[PDB]
Amino acid sequence: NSNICEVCNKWGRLFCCDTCPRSFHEHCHIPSVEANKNPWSCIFCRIKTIQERCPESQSGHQESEVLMRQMLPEEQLKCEFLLLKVYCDSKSCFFASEPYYNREGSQGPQKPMWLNKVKTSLNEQMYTRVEGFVQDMRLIFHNHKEFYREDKFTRLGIQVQDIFEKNFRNIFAIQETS
Ligand SMILES: [Zn+2]
Ligand SMILES: [Zn+2]
Ligand SMILES: [Zn+2]
């Protein structure tokens, strides 16, 4: 197994996957690494199994159909993995915890949102469709763009949104277009 956490790239108290060489901090993995279960298979492994059981699940899909899917166990997993892929980027630190807004010439958003809030909401099964999760994720970046206006710090939102969108198209096998 790897000697660093796959998500945050730090050593520490790591749990090792049984079916691949990745390792995780307890609360870096999503869902949090399960208490027992030997062998244990990480989210990367569980996603790969879904694809292997249904190869046709990788044919192209329309985003509008994906968003209306109910959050059954396989869609719950896919959203958990998508969330984890964002945390994998170090720039996610900016969007992880609860923001506050006091900048001359800007007003804070009407509906603040952050990664750890989305994480709790998934854990508590608060989303009934994929659209719920994707709307809250996109809201994070939209709030940031609007608040920071012309400051160059706006670019951090563009950057992390691009990680989210690339991973969304991959995980949910969105039909490729120009
Ligand atoms: Zn970690
Ligand atoms: Zn694994
Ligand atoms: Zn199948």
The first and second tokens of residue 6, run together, are 């796959």
What resolution, expressed in A, was reported for this entry?
1.6
Ligand index nearest the alpha carbon of residue 25: 1
Alpha-carbon span 130 to 123, nearest angstrom: 14
The first and second tokens of residue 140, run together, are 């994070």
Long-range contacts of 65-73 (CB under 8 A, 24+ apart): 66/130, 66/172, 66/174, 67/129, 67/130, 67/131, 67/134, 68/129, 68/130, 68/131, 69/129, 69/130, 70/128, 70/129, 71/125, 71/127, 71/128, 71/129, 71/130, 71/132, 71/133
Determination technique for this entry: X-ray
Task: Indicate whether 35 and 11 sit together in one domain.
Answer: yes
Going from the Cα of 137 to the center of ligand 3, the distance in angstroms, rounded, reads 29
Q: Which of 15, 41, 59 is where one domain is finished?
A: 59
Going from the Cα of 89 to the center of ligand 2, the distance in angstroms, rounded, reads 19
Specify the number of domains making up the chain.
Answer: 2
Ligand index nearest the alpha carbon of residue 58: 3
CATH code, domain with 11: 3.30.40.10
Task: Indicate whether 55 and 79 sit together in one domain.
Answer: no
Task: Indicate whether 15 and 87 sit together in one domain.
Answer: no
- C-alpha distances in Å from residue 37, one per residue of 13, 28, 34, 151: 18, 18, 7, 48
66: Cβ–Cβ under 8 A, 6 or more apart, which residues?
130, 172, 174
Going from the Cα of 70 to the center of ligand 3, the distance in angstroms, rounded, reads 18
Going from the Cα of 29 to the center of ligand 1, the distance in angstroms, rounded, reads 8
Burial per residue of 81-111, b for 16 or more beta-carbon CB atoms within 10 angstroms, e otherwise = bbbbbbbbbeebebbbeebeeeeeeeeebee
**Which range marks the domain in which residue 140 is found?**
60-178
CATH code, domain with 178: 1.20.920.10
Task: Indicate whether 64 and 49 sit together in one domain.
Answer: no
